[model samples]
Target: DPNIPTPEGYALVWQEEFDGRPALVNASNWRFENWAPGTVNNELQRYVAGGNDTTAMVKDGALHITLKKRGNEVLSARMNSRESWQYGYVEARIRLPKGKGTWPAFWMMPVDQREGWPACGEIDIMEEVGTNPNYTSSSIHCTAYNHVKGTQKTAERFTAGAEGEYHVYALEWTADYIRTFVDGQPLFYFANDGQRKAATWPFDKPFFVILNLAWGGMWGGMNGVDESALPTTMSVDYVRVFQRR
Candidate 1:
């Protein structure tokens, strides 16, 4: 039974308040990865450097990760933490940008890649594929059951049009379970051990946070971009990780 705290005592272990300029806070704690076009996920967006002209920026008290059209593809930004932790409660307060082709996600990946992806494991804390406007999804990827094998996966939906409001998207990851939440509401939960073996549950290792907004991917492009929906932005008020001391 994994649960999340509503307030206090979650002594901010790490955070990006996005309050000041575009410069990253705790530079040593964060790292920017410039993703080339058609990277790992076959995602359409080009992740550029710096928080400048790029879509990744701190403005108006929020981290703005915008998605815009560029030639035949789209361009955006992504950022991740340099350090990784094993077991902790990670959360983000975010307001998604809406459109027919927008894809916003908050997820994590295992630091070690000995077995490669899926086998190395991937945790999707929160993902919203524009095709499914009324709902957001949370899932896990492992060798036993990945997008290819279609075995290790789970999802839940919430009220439509949630993009307009600021909601708390979180994952409570402990030695036993992983639970997902939206606006303080429970959506999905997964226990580390059940029908799955330890090797299939790669979450026990160090994992880092990733925030990005993609456009027109295999999933997001299903419905196709409206084109008129260009210049949409995902607003992230803050990202924090809490752990037992």
Candidate 2:
């Protein structure tokens, strides 16, 4: 078993260490995404469902989400946790992929989505666009604050060795606030308005975790792409969750 730590005042609730190989993603814990290119972000990748070893697999004790170029197409993986939680401390130790068109993200989406996007809310724990390989960011989107409105709450910081080194990206979410961190260092924060309006606090509902590696989308393609960078991968050492005791 992996060494699971319990934070003070919190108990370990769930975890995945990506220990085994050969069709390693546990179906009981994750759901795959089967999306064609240009589905949501106009991305240049075709997300394969029930990922193959070359796309999503556990090798060398870490889960690898890879993007490979096949002639005129790119194949990738997007996995979402089957379990959802309301509030907790969620974290993942990851080493980002390198390449100009890589867009790797560790994020969350509301389980009981009652409205269209933004209104449903989103929690981005860590997002790195390979064009800027040394920078990582976090953000929250809701009806009142979204990128489409240019009012999203977000933050970015330069992380040394972010593209090739393993670092913990985390989020501590509670009833009153949401905070994101890198290697335990603060990145971004958002506070509930106290008015109890879903517009700014749709996070009151349960949310499921997501891990995906996209290619050449609106943000990742801003500069341009180089197919020579194909077959790059994002490796995840583990994902852990802790809830208040």
Candidate 3:
């Protein structure tokens, strides 16, 4: 049922509408992920967490993630779900910023960080790069096939209002496979076809959600940035998770 976020028999179990106290991002639920390695794609923004890093604030019933450029400095934010799940349906309604120096994504990573990166797994349900305003992509990374190996499984779809309006970004993950969509329309499909090996299908474990707006990373900063367009932003209306009833 790629045309529907929740099938006829499903019911939502968890959600965040940004309907809480305005201007406050409940850091109690999701904390920032200041990557220990501290890096990106020849890009220049420093991913920050807490205090003076108010870039990730909530307002107008939405979560606004903004990136800023001050002189020679660049800063942004990345939030990781404090909770993880095995399999379910997850969706988010978002409005991407206006131009080409941004990178926003709604994705997932294994809950167990001890395994570290590709070996554990990565599921990119929705990713929009500033360089490509109307195109959004989805991808999966496992040990055998990842960006490092240049063989990750990925797909793309066109969305008419990606640069200025709100649209749903979603993922339907099941014991069988994972599917990604935009406004209920399928964009990518990664099937779990018998070739089940930990090195290839490591998604069986719990995976957590991640919402981030990166500046000039491997993909985001590929085409260079517009210092003038310093404060790029993306707003999220809601995030919901559904389960089979």
- Among these predicted structures, which one has the highest lDDT? 2
Predicted structure 2, TM vs. truth: 0.95
Residue 136 lDDT, candidate 2, scale 0-100 = 99
Q: Please provide, for model 1 over 54-138, each residue's C-alpha lDDT reduced to its tens digit, 9 standing for 90 to 100.
A: 6776777877888877677577888788878788878898888888888898999878988887788888888997667758888
Residue pairs in clash, model 1:
145-152
- Global CA lDDT computed for model 2: 0.90
| Model 1: CA > 4 A from native | 1-10, 20-26, 71-73, 194-196
Total clashes in model 3, counting residue pairs 3 or more apart in sequence or in different chains: 3
Residues 137-243 of candidate 2: C-alpha lDDT, one tens digit per residue: 99999989987889999999999999989999999999999999999899999999899898989888899999999999998888887789988999999999999
Error of 1 at 13 (Å): 1.3
Ranking 2 against 3 by lDDT, winner: 2
List the pairs of residues colliding in candidate 3.
41-217, 41-218, 216-221
lDDT of 3 at 207: 84
Task: Give residue 47's lDDT in candidate 3 (0 to 100).
Answer: 71
Taking the tens digit of each residue's C-alpha lDDT, what string does model 3 give over 15-104?
Answer: 777774447677666878665223745656677674554668888899888888645677778888787888888899999875566889
The top-ranked prediction according to TM-score is 2
lDDT scores for all predictions?
Answer: 0.77, 0.90, 0.80
